[PDB]
Every structure is written in structure tokens, then in C-alpha cells.
Design an enzyme around this catalytic site. Structure first.
Site: not given
Ligand SMILES: N[C@@H](CCC(=O)O)C(=O)O
Ligand SMILES: N[C@@H](CCC(=O)O)C(=O)O
Ligand SMILES: N[C@@H](CCC(=O)O)C(=O)O
Ligand SMILES: N[C@@H](CCC(=O)O)C(=O)O
Lengths: 303, 308, 305, 305
Positions: B12, B40-41, B71-72
């Protein structure tokens, strides 16, 4: 003194003569397994036994292994139609070890099953002097006696000197307020769980689709997000009619609707605060009623 | 003022980045670069290898690193870097739980505090760090505990190293497990990592996922066991075959805190299994992939799981 | 087998009650005092510190049996005043020894395991409860009744105990034991330090009573980040400029009372407690006041110990 | 869109600063007072409860902006004294409004979301912080600095806020708001209730100063399960025999101070606070003392509210 039935299933747990002061206890062995080997047949046996024997007793205590107690409790929470107290209990230390927790745990489970205020709260887990609802309760620590917690919404009550101060009850529908009726089932729909992580293989998901599973729960990353090859496999499977529930490997918090995954586009369901193993229980029961993703989402919004 | 490099991966939260947080000019000379741009997924081995080689090659160009990340899977990348980075300058990962356009976006201050941490000479030699919600967390123990909360990242077994107040850190802890330049893992010449998959245990668990990873010849399988790393009977059966036929088996736990111990219900020596200790499934995968660059012997991999 | 001394103080022949102790140590016990820990006091602290310091070379490690209510206070006092760097482990029980699933037997076993472990040395005074090794500085009672009540709420535990083995992953960075300047070998009393609570509409009368009695120090259990109710601020700001040491702590159970937030301690002659809760801040202030009355030096002590 | 009134009392936290408010409510504000919540007092409490009670039919819900340090006390006071069954939501911020990643804007938005949700009615006075809806009775500040500080540490939150929607799964069982007997419509003052702290070697001087001043009530922040240092016990036992109400609470941050433990409350004329922490127990004791001075009736009030 109330009549309380102990249904034994196994786990590390007359040895507790103080029970005579609070109930008339009778026990039946249902099965004798480590809870790591818990299965659909035991669930079906247990729900049918409690539902059949409800008018013979004033409440139930189920002794069970701690490893999958949180799954059995939720299954019973959805399928039991007896609104008399139904309390699960186990032990984190062997019955022969120093400071074994099973004796007190059992006493407190019977206290809870004997308390008429326990009725109408759904299936409970009583561990470490705490009354926990079967929906939210989960094992948080691999060894601690204090491991069982309701990590999203907190406990229903605390036990002090054989009395419960209840300050909460579950709002989600349970027991006699659900549509799930397993009275005539000898099997449950096939629902598997796949894990997400960096570089995740799509082979587990593909294997469950190839076997024709009725449902797949994803233990997603963060807010139920999927590794792309897992997403691809589950998106394809949902278009062929496999039910797909996005849950999360993250141990607290909801997998929400309206976040990063377009669930309406893919035909996916978001699990809410249900962790992957709990989400499996509700999905397998939803699939006894419907294969429709919007109806499965409604079920995940109410139960 | 220290020189700090931002390596951006996605998530983000690099002149766009720097210009959103002008206060960074007060504490560092910031430069950096976009390494990849992914959620990051979808994080993967190739990104990990790119990052470790980039940090290791660029270590003398800067006084510390900040990696911006989704964050994931931040907790997985952090542990990989904690084992493979040979630069003992501060290496700090950071993300954001709320979109940068949202009310009370956490990204700006999170980035500020990450640069504070990377700029603090006391951060050096503590391994790769995660800085989130005013807290300095070690890359080994740090995990995402909550799906939405800004306060989600915690070191759930041993606690944080330090807390940040007004741009200062009071460090009270440092990880005892060997990290960075004290590990034998060297990925400088690897373009691929050993294939390690994760299977889940639960009531009535299918053996199909474990069988699929054995059929494909995986180097390793990590089990997300029930309780203290326990296995559903049919998964046990498959993993027993795997461990005797060239696939390393690590028992971890789906349970979010506490160790999967040796000397509990599973006789690991008899099956050729390894117990993960406090490493959760995704972290156990990281160390098993790196262990398998050095050895296929289960007693040596157990030793690695007892030291790193 | 190591030689372990159990020093009993009160709270809830031990080789007979817990025969498994024979497998891990040669235990001898001595009764130092017999009190409920709600009645713990400076005289018991001084007796324990002198006893451990005198007896250090006669044994391989110590277990102190203690009531749970003030174990966190005694543990920190010993952590600052013990000069023996052999393992010193405090232990209690949350359930009566005659109750169903009494926790004391296994707690005591694990305490002896910890005191018998050479890896336990040099980590300062420890508290061992619910299979967990906790440093004496951060460890606190978090729940009124739970067997799992003791936690290191700011920095976490040093190690966990499984099957009689410890995996230590942490050690306290703050100076303890033989690295402190505090030496109580010649003292029969400690500086007088009281605690006052803050809340909406807080009375100034408790603070005034301790000033009128000539207390050496006052710890404030502040609201939020060590903040003070107006009338309490008035009393303590006068006291700090007229010979009373004043430490701002917090009634909030976790996190630091920081420097450089709302209260300008340098200007008022106050000290900020950091992560020390009011009762722990009292321990360090009493010992600081054996060395100095200067607020800047007391602040340095609260920054290092 | 619902009409929502913001009553400002002070702390770090206009439809101008948070224009997204216009999407969810018609907001109007009034400044009741402007103080740091460390200076919160009975007069502000009485003003707020009478304003909400008087103005209930002019609006569809209330948001009270307040400092975080004593928000938990004000919230419980309002929870017991408000007779408006419309949503009453308290909110604050842990970071200054001008700081990076200030939490006030989203906190205020979510507070208005909650006050606008019809399902919030009849849950008692609420605290909304960090995307969470907390009941006024159990909510407490658990950390000195964390934006996630506010938790319902015994029974957990009522609901979580995601994209402007609440999933409510819990409601307080204890009677609140229009279901209590407390009516402060004609009071200009509250009974005098102070708090004393227990610790090792505790002075009895604070307790004696409150008794010398003729306090109506004293709350003890006891050790463990509401235990008292001997000299504090002695002072409070003497005071209770002369008619001072005495509530045993605990400094321990979670769990009940129970009846039927170490202290024979019936013999001394003492009341056990249950899960109410010292500052919360003060609120209920002050309000109990508007109805009764009898220890058994005060205990029943502590068992129901
Ligand atoms: N799924 C996203 C969520 C947004 C974030 O954490 O930056 C990721 O991990 O990249
Ligand atoms: N794996 C065992 C652990 C022992 C127990 O919890 O009873 C089980 O869950 O049955
Ligand atoms: N108040 C007692 C409680 C019992 C115990 O912990 O031994 C004490 O702290 O001594
Ligand atoms: N002492 C201030 C802290 C800042 C705030 O929370 O607004 C108060 O409680 O008012």
C-alpha cells in the site's frame, strides 16, 4: 442435584469425587481417539447421540482431545438441537503429570453443565476457569494450560468457587436456531483446506478439485488473499461448481467482503471471523442445504 | 545525516514515496529504487533471491536499508532476509495496513519510524527487523496476528526488541538465534530454491495435498499440525512415506503461538521428521528451503532448526 | 546433581511433596520469613538480599518461594541488589496446594529446573511461572486468578520450559545484579517512598500526607502517559523543588511513561519511570535515593536499570 | 441521514477537518468544556449527563470527543447516568491531530458511523477506538502510547467496524443507562470517593488522610485478588466501622476482585468490586452512595451494574 451425562471421545482425560457434590454423573464412551484423528463419523455420532438423549438428562459434558476441540465444538454448536447445557472439556497436561489440569477442568465443565444459566448459549468449551462459546473458541498456544481463548469477541463467563458470572452470549444463531439437521446423514460433503504463503504450490488445490471435492477453504494471507496460482485454480473450480470459502491463516480478525478480492466476480464466499478449520465446518453443513455461493455467503453472515 | 536506501517491492505504502513524507529529510539522506512492484500475496523465491543479492551487493553504498513491502507475507520475506543477508548494517522492513489515500493512513509514520530504525546505529547486528506501529520486531518471531488492525505485527513468542517514542528507540532485547553473517546460508550463486510446500491438518484432513507434493518430487513439506505439531492419520501416513523417499518433513503447527517440540507425541527420530520449534508453517518453510541448500539429512536439519 | 537452596517466605521436606525434585537437584530449604506477600516489606527484602549475597558460594542456585501478590516487587528488588550471578528464581502458586489441579508442585519443579540450568546464570533474578522464565524487571501479575497470570508485558519472556529443558532466546539488556551500584549489605532501612493514584477529581490529600511525613520519594500512578490530576500536579511540583524525589509512572498496565511527552520533567525536577509500573518504580527510586537525591542522576538510573 | 451531535470536552480531537462525515450524518457540535482529560472532574460529568438527558429528543445520537487518559471513567459514569437510549459514543485520539498518521480523523469518522447505526441503540454508552466498538463498563486504556490501547480486557468488544459497517456480536448483560436507579438531574455534587494504592511496605497515610477529610467512600487498588497491606487494612476496617464505604478493587489489570477469597468482606463491611478496576469502582461507588450507605446494598449494586 442435576443429572449430567459425560460423553467420552478420547484425549488425555471418580478420580474427581468432588463431582458428587454438584451433579449425578453418568458416563458413556462414544469413541476413544486422539483428537488429531477426529473425523466426520464421530461428529455425526455425537450430534445424533446428544439430540436423541436430550430428554434423558439435564446437560452434557463431552471429554475430548484439545487439538481439534474447537472444530467439534463448532460442529455441535450448529447441529445440536438440545438447548440444555452442552459443554466440551479437555486437558493440556497428562492425567499422571505434576499439576495435571484435567481434574479441575472436568469439575468446572460439570459446574457449567449444571448451571441452568448455561442453557440457550450454544455449545460451550470450558477450560482454565473460563466459559467460551463454541464458535469463537480456538487453541492459541501449543502447550499452555491457558491456551483456549475466544480471540475475536471474548469469553461468556468466568468460574470462581463453582459459580459463573455470565456477562455475554453469542449473537450468531446456534443449535435449534440453525437449519442444519444431520439426523439422516451418514456422510458430510467433502471440504478440504489449502494454505497460502510465498511461492505457494497450486498442487494441493488441484488435487482436491481433481478428486471432485464439494468445497475448498483457503487459509489465505492477510485479509483472505490468495497466491496467484491458488487463486487461478480456485477461480476455475468455482466456475465448475466447487464452493470456495476465503478464510485466513491470520489467527484473529475477519476475512471481509469488499476488500481486495472481487468475490462476486469469482463466486467466492468470505469466512468472516471463522478460521480455516471452523470455516470448513460451516461450509460442509452449508453444502448439505445449497451449492449456491450467494446462499452460502448468507449462511456465513448468520451462523 | 545517515544515508538510507529504500528498496520498494510493492504493497500500500521512489520519488513518489519520499515526497509524501518530507519529514524523512530531517533524519536521513534517502535514496532508493523500485526492485519489483507486486502485492505480497504473490511474493516468491525470485523476489527473495533478488533482494538478498541486492542488499548484499549494495551494503557498502549505504548506511542502512528500508524495504517497503505488502503486509500479507512481510513476515516470510523478513525471515528469509534475516538468514541470507550478510550486511550487518540495519535492514528494516515496513508496510501499511490502510491504503495511503485513506483517513488516518498509517504508511507515512510507519515509513518515518522505519527510517528512524535503519538510521539508528544501535539497530545494527540485531538481524533483519520489521518496524510497525512504533515497535521494532525481530524478523524471526514477527507475525501478522490480525487481518485488519494497524497494530497487527507482533513477536508473539518472545516480544519486541524496542519501542520508538519521538524518534528514539529504547532497545531492551536482541535475538539469541544466529542470523545474517552468522549463518551458513549463501544464496549469492542460486537462481532457484528447493521446493517446499505446506499442508494443513484438521478433522478428516485429506491426504491429497501431501500426496500431490510427494508425487511432484518436492524437496520438503512443512505440516501445519494440530496442537503440538500433531498429524491427522492419513496425512501422517503420507508424510511417513515422504520422509523415507527423499522429501524432508518439518512438523510445525497451525496454532498461532508456542513451539512444536521434540519429545511429544510424535517420534520424530523413528520417522525422519524435524520439529519446527516456535517457527510457524510459513517461517518453517523459509528455514527448510535454506537447510536443503546445505543438507538432506534430518538430524542435521533438526540441528539447523535448533540454531537458526 | 546441582545443589539448590529453597528460601521460603510464605504464600501457598519439599523433596517429599514433589519427589521428582530428587531427579534434578539436591535440595535444601530454609524458612526466611512466613508472611502473606500482601504484607511484604523493606525488612524482608533486606534480609533476603543479604542472605543470598552471604550464601551465594554455599550452593549452586536459589529458589525463593513467595506469595504471588507482590512477587513482582521482591523480584525487581533482588534483581537490583543481589551480587550472586548464580541462578536466583522466584516461584509461587495461584491455587491453594490442597485444591484440585494445584499449580504449586509443577511450578516448584520448573523453578528448580531453571535454578539448576547453567544457562540461567547471568540473566538477573527470574520468576518462573506457568512453564515460562520471566525477567524480574518486566514480570507483572496481569490477572487476579489465572494460573497464567505472570507476564513480561512490555518485552516478553526469556525462555519457555518443555520436558525440563529451557530454550532461552532473550536476556535483559538493562543492568542487573553485580552490574548495579546498589549495595544494601550495611542497610537496615530503605528510603521512604509512597505511591499516589490519579483519576478524575483525584484528591491531593494522599500526596500531601506523604510530603507532610517527610517521605524521601513519591511515585505517581499517572493517567495515560504518566499525567497528573491538577491538584496532584500542584502538590508534587512543589514537593520536587523542596527536597522530595518525584517519579512519574502510570496506572496503565503496559508501555512506558516517556520523557518529552506532555510533562516537562527536567523543568519540574521529576523523573519519568519508563516501562516501570508504580510498584516497580518505587523499588528503583528507593535504591536510587541510597545513592543520590539529584533528579538528573535519578533519571539516568531510571534509564540504565 | 441521521442528525448527530458532537459534544466536545477537550483532548487532541469540525465537518471541515473530516469532510467524509457529510456522507454519513448531519453533524452539529457544541463545546461543553475544553480540558485535558487528566483534569476531568465531577462537575464535567454532571454537565455532560444532564446535557445528553436534556437534549436527547433534539438529535438522533451523540459523539463525545474527550482526552484518552480518563475516557474510560467518563464512559462508565455516562453509562450509569444517561437515560437517552439513542447511541452515545465516546472518542479520542492517541496522536496529535497535526502528527504524521494522526488517528483522530478516522476515529471520529468511525465514532459517527457507530452513533448513526440504529443497532448501537440500547447497548449502553460506547467507546469507539481503533475500528472497534467497546462497552463503557469494561473498556480501559491498556497501553501508554499505542493507537490500539483501548480494549475491553475481561469480556471483549461488542463489534468491529469494516468499511463503515458494524458487525455487532455482543451486548453488555449488566444493566445500564435508562435501566439504572441513578439520577443525577438534581445533583450539583457527587459523594467524595478516593483511591489508595497497595504495594510492599504501603503507607497508611493516604487512607488516613481520606478518612480524616470525611470521605464518603474509599476504593482500594489492592494487590492480587483485592488484598490489602496490613496497615491499609487496619485503617480501612476502622473507617468502615464508623460508616465509610470501602470497596476492594485491584491494581491487577484484568480479572475480578471476588467475594469469598482472603478477605471476609461481611465481617469488615467491605464491598468486592468484581471486574471494576479502581477508577471504575470509584464511579459506581460515588453513584451507589447517592442511593445508600449500606454495605450489603452497595454489594448488590456492584453485582448488577
Ligand atoms: N495483499 C496486499 C495488501 C496491501 C499491503 O499490505 O500492502 C499485500 O500484502 O501487498
Ligand atoms: N493430540 C492429543 C493431545 C492430548 C489431548 O489434548 O488430550 C489430542 O488432541 O487428543
Ligand atoms: N495474598 C497471598 C495469596 C496466596 C499466594 O499467592 O501464596 C500472597 O500473595 O501471599
Ligand atoms: N492528557 C491528554 C492526552 C491527549 C489526548 O488523549 O487527547 C488527555 O487525556 O486529554
Amino acid at each position: 442435584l442435576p443429572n449430567i451425562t459425560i460423553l467420552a471421545t478420547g484425549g488425555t482425560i471418580n478420580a474427581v469425587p468432588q463431582l458428587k457434590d454438584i451433579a449425578n454423573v453418568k458416563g458413556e464412551q462414544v469413541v476413544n481417539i486422539g483428537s488429531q484423528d477426529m473425523n466426520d463419523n464421530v461428529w455425526l455420532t455425537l450430534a445424533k447421540k446428544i439430540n436423541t438423549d436430550c430428554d434423558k438428562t439435564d446437560g452434557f459434558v463431552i471429554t475430548h482431545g484439545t487439538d481439534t476441540m474447537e472444530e467439534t465444538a463448532y460442529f455441535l454448536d450448529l447441529t445440536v438441537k438440545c438447548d440444555k447445557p452442552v459443554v466440551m472439556v479437555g486437558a493440556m497436561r497428562p492425567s499422571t503429570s505434576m499439576s495435571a489440569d484435567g481434574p479441575f477442568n472436568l469439575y468446572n465443565a460439570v459446574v457449567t453443565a449444571a448451571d441452568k444459566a448455561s442453557a440457550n448459549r450454544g455449545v460451550l468449551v470450558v477450560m482454565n476457569d473460563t466459559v467460551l462459546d463454541g464458535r469463537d473458541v480456538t487453541k492459541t498456544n501449543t502447550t499452555d494450560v491457558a491456551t483456549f481463548k475466544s480471540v475475536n469477541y471474548g469469553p461468556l463467563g468466568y468460574i470462581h468457587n463453582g459459580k459463573i458470572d455470565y456477562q455475554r452470549t453469542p449473537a450468531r444463531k446456534h443449535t435449534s436456531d440453525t437449519p442444519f439437521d444431520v439426523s439422516k446423514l451418514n456422510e458430510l460433503p467433502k471440504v478440504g483446506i489449502v494454505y497460502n504463503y510465498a511461492n505457494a504450490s497450486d498442487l494441493p488445490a488441484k488435487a482436491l478439485v481433481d478428486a471432485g471435492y464439494d468445497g475448498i477453504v483457503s487459509a489465505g494471507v492477510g485479509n483472505g488473499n490468495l497466491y496467484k496460482s491458488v487463486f487461478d485454480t480456485l477461480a476455475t473450480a468455482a466456475k465448475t461448481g466447487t464452493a470456495v470459502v476465503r478464510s485466513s491463516r491470520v489467527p484473529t480478525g475477519a476475512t471481509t467482503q469488499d476488500a481486495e478480492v472481487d468475490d462476486a466476480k469469482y463466486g467466492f464466499v468470505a469466512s468472516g471471523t471463522l478460521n480455516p478449520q471452523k470455516a470448513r465446518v460451516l461450509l460442509q453443513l452449508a453444502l448439505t442445504q445449497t451449492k449456491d455461493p450467494q446462499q452460502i455467503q448468507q449462511i456465513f453472515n448468520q451462523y
